[PDB]
Design a protein that fits this description.
part of a larger assembly; 6 chains; A mainly alpha; C mainly alpha; D mainly alpha; A: mainly alpha; two-stranded parallel ribbon; 3 strands; D: mainly alpha; two-stranded parallel sheet; 6 helices; globular; binds a molecule of 2 linked components (NAG-NAG); binds 2-acetamido-2-deoxy-beta-D-glucopyranose; transport protein; Ligand-gated Ion Channel; NMDA Receptor
Chain lengths: 132, 133, 143, 143, 132, 133
């Protein structure tokens, strides 16, 4: 995970980055002790995630910073792709919305109705839990 | 509706014959609920850019289909012009702050509801609103 | 897990002809460590005068590229250099046992009223673990 | 490590008469977990009526004595109870993936103006590691 | 060391204490987040450190917070007594001095003169450095 | 000069016959430069009255001998009455936190300079000044 102190001062043997103009860039711009990595990975940011997956598959990288279930799905696709053990910034994907609008209450209530039953579990059975 | 091509979430795949999706089945025979979205290519001056419609399915697409099944409302899924989520980026003249990506298409009125793998943080919730994750 | 050098006053430190290869070490020029050596061993400074170098990371590169074998400097700075070492290759000798054993501080003018306030504030900052938190933040003693 | 139950959709959760050991599952009374049960499996509530209990620590003692076999509660509270359990003889199933997967929050009055400031302050508390610092302080990650 | 949660949440068999009215009690009384140990160490406060050594040798004490030199010396003397390595509250042993007095500067310069040469090394060779 | 019983710093032993000390030799033949300290047998409940000049030596004793050889003064070595370092503990009248131990003997004029393993912290330096460790 992130608590490897040798990645705090990276070099040409630690080639890792994140997606250009992603949320990872803002999250590493806020935390000041992650500034040095922020001053390294700004030299190698990529336009999309699949380009980074194809780059790290050919060993043109060494690590990659991304969300959990996407990288677990990529590990279920390709066995050489391995997620690390540590975990940080435990947050949530929700629905991006407008300002004051009549789609605030019932959208959240419908998502929560999908949480109370096993419909989110069925959607996990479609793609998230699904191994190959 | 705007979204980005996320490989475990939003599968975007070109059409088979004429603006239509191949009816693919799952392991249980459940038909994959696909939608006719609109997908532009990444480099518009690098190649002849057509902006053809395309097929969108997967995790968040089926979540949106369930949401449209719940409340009576139609939808039009389109995609982002450039593959960025959206960041608080400063423009060159007068050092003014602006937004790009899906948030840049949201605040410009081009979008109405972002159903996409969007990460909740502090700087986004100051300007837009968030449902429960 | 061995000891190449015993301490500051090793028996090898009296003659380079006692060494079978030509031994080399170094410090930083015009430092207080050099003044401590000159007030302890002037002959050690006379051997080191032919073996000077430029700076900290210059000596670090000379240690990595095999141009240098030892480097005498402050304790915690070399502990941090071992913390940022490429795979714990360069290892210090002990933890400050056969050495000068001093500390840092804040230099003030003689008779300044800021002395007692800074003294009590630093002894309060040690007394609540906040200095240990700063040492955890800025000094990572790996391996 | 082995897991005899691999989710809430297990075949053993249908009826303990179906299998040769009749086991017991435990919940807490008057909770939203029971509302999730009664909106998912009313028969699970009907057999929980056979297998009720009173106290969370009392149910912990009943698990330690073997009078109770399975137990159903929230995630982080049972994770903290397993983090301070003597011997770590009580292990959960996974890390919350075949489950409800909700979150704890701050409930306010409907139409209160304090919602936006509390939401911005909590999202500031998440995105700087201070929330993770408090989680490290108030949870034990052993065994 | 101090990072054991068994000492953060003690029991009736993890008997840790300190010398009564020492710097350990002051340092664990200032830190209110270490108040729990402050509730425990009052059970078995002793007078001299040799009483604590005889208690921990006969397994009456299970842990004992103390300065490093005396415990490392007793570990050099007795093989069964084992110290730990988690060092905390790096302090100094200094000569206890008066108020404004004409011995504050001369004695301090003499101690620093003892620091610059190898006289502290000779004092280590008397009792401190030699292992047994 | 006041100190406290710690064996790797101040070895405390009764005398050989009366006042004189054992001429002990180290591993290099060095005679241990001892001092005739004045100490009690035990505390006041344990020992009613047994306070004799005893032999004291070791680490801080040799440090004090080096200081007495460096600067031009003679000295006097005694012991602490109780078995405490000294803390700012409450007294009965006026609910005031008074001192005890080595600091209680220093501030009462019974000592002149504490040469002892004094753990430097804030509260001890809030009243008296220190030296370099
Ligand atoms: C959100 O869903 C609720 C479901 O209760 C809707 O509330 C009902 O809708 C009617 C519409 O005329 C309202 O008059 C009432 O407030 C509700 N029913 C009754 C009779 O209590 C609500 O309209 C939905 N809002 C939208 C459109 O998003
Ligand atoms: C759980 O809820 C029920 C309902 O409040 C409580 O059960 C009894 O409910 C009747 C309703 O008339 C009351 O008269 C009793 O006072 C309730 N029981 C007792 C002994 O107080 C029940 O107590 C609640 N508490 C739990 C945790 O079981
Ligand atoms: C978008 O992508 C393809 C391949 O890059 C490109 O040839 C074309 O301009 C677009 N779509 C079509 C019509 O294939
Ligand atoms: C759909 O819209 C119509 C017309 O407003 C309305 O009658 C109906 O209740 C809505 N809901 C359904 C059933 O989709
Ligand atoms: C502003 O400068 C950036 C490079 O930093 C460039 O990408 C952009 O095209 C410039 N102008 C606009 C349109 O913002
Ligand atoms: C302290 O040292 C200086 C060195 O010359 C000496 O002159 C001075 O008298 C000393 N002070 C005392 C009080 O001994
Ligand atoms: C010291 O201890 C006892 C009191 O506990 C006293 O009666 C006795 O005379 C003393 N013994 C020695 C060692 O002189
Ligand atoms: C020390 O003081 C004594 C007088 O008390 C006298 O021998 C001389 O002034 C001093 N000696 C040395 C060598 O400092
Ligand atoms: C006050 O006096 C009582 C006896 O009445 C004694 O037990 C206690 O130690 C004293 N406390 C203080 C604060 O001196």
């Amino acid at each position: 995970g992130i608590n490897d102190p040798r990645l705090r001062n990276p070099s040409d043997k630690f080639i890792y980055a994140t997606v250009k103009q992603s949320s990872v860039d803002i999250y590493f711009r806020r935390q000041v002790e992650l500034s040095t990595m922020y001053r390294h990975m700004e030299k190698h940011n990529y336009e999309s995630a699949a380009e980074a997956i194809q780059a790290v598959r050919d060993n043109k990288l060494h690590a990659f910073i991304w969300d959990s279930a996407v990288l677990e799905f990529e590990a279920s696709q390709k066995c050489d792709l391995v997620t690390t053990g540590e975990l940080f910034f435990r947050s949530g994907f929700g629905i991006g919305m407008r300002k004051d609008s009549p789609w605030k209450q019932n959208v959240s209530l419908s998502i929560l109705k999908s949480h109370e039953n096993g419909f989110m579990e069925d959607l996990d059975k479609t793609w998230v839990r699904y191994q190959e | 509706i705007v979204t980005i091509h996320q490989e475990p979430f939003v599968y975007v795949k070109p059409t088979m014959s004429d603006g239509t999706c191949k009816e693919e089945f799952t392991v249980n025979g459940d038909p994959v609920k696909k939608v006719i979205c609109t997908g532009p290519n990444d480099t518009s001056p690098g190649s002849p850019r057509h902006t053809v419609p395309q097929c969108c399915y997967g995790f968040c697409i089926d979540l949106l289909i369930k949401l449209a099944r719940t409340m009576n409302f139609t939808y039009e899924v389109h995609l982002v012009a450039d593959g960025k989520f959206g960041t608080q980026e400063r423009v060159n003249n007068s050092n003014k702050k602006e937004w790009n990506g899906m948030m840049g298409e949201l605040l410009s009125g081009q979008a109405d509801m972002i159903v996409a793998p969007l990460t909740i943080n502090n700087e986004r919730a100051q300007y837009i609103e968030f449902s429960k994750p | 897990f061995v000891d190449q050098v015993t301490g500051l006053s090793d028996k090898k430190f009296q003659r380079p002809h006692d060494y079978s290869p030509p031994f080399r070490f170094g410090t930083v020029p015009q430092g207080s460590t050099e003044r401590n050596i000159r007030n302890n061993y002037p002959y050690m400074h006379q051997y080191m005068t032919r073996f000077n170098q430029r700076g900290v990371e210059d000596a670090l590169v000379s240690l990595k590229t095999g141009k240098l074998d030892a480097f005498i400097y402050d304790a915690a700075v070399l502990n941090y250099k071992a913390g940022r070492d490429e795979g714990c290759k360069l290892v210090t000798i002990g933890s400050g046992y056969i050495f000068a054993t001093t500390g840092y501080g804040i230099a003030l003018q003689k008779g300044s009223p800021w002395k007692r306030q800074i003294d009590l504030a630093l002894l309060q900052f040690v007394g609540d673990g906040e200095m240990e938190e700063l040492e955890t933040l800025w000094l990572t003693g790996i391996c | 490590f082995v897991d005899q139950v691999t989710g809430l959709s297990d075949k053993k959760f249908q009826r303990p008469h179906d299998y040769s050991p009749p086991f017991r599952f435990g919940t807490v009374p008057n909770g939203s977990t029971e509302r999730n049960i009664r909106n998912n499996y009313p028969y699970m509530h009907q057999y929980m009526t056979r297998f009720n209990q009173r106290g969370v620590e009392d149910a912990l003692v009943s698990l330690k004595t073997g009078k109770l076999d399975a137990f159903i509660y929230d995630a982080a509270v049972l994770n903290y109870k397993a983090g301070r359990d003597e011997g770590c003889k009580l292990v959960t199933i996974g890390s919350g993936y075949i489950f409800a997967t909700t979150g704890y929050g701050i409930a306010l009055q409907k139409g209160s103006p304090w919602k936006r400031q509390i939401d911005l302050a909590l999202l500031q508390f998440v995105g700087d590691g201070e929330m993770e610092e408090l989680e490290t302080l108030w949870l034990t990650g052993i065994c």
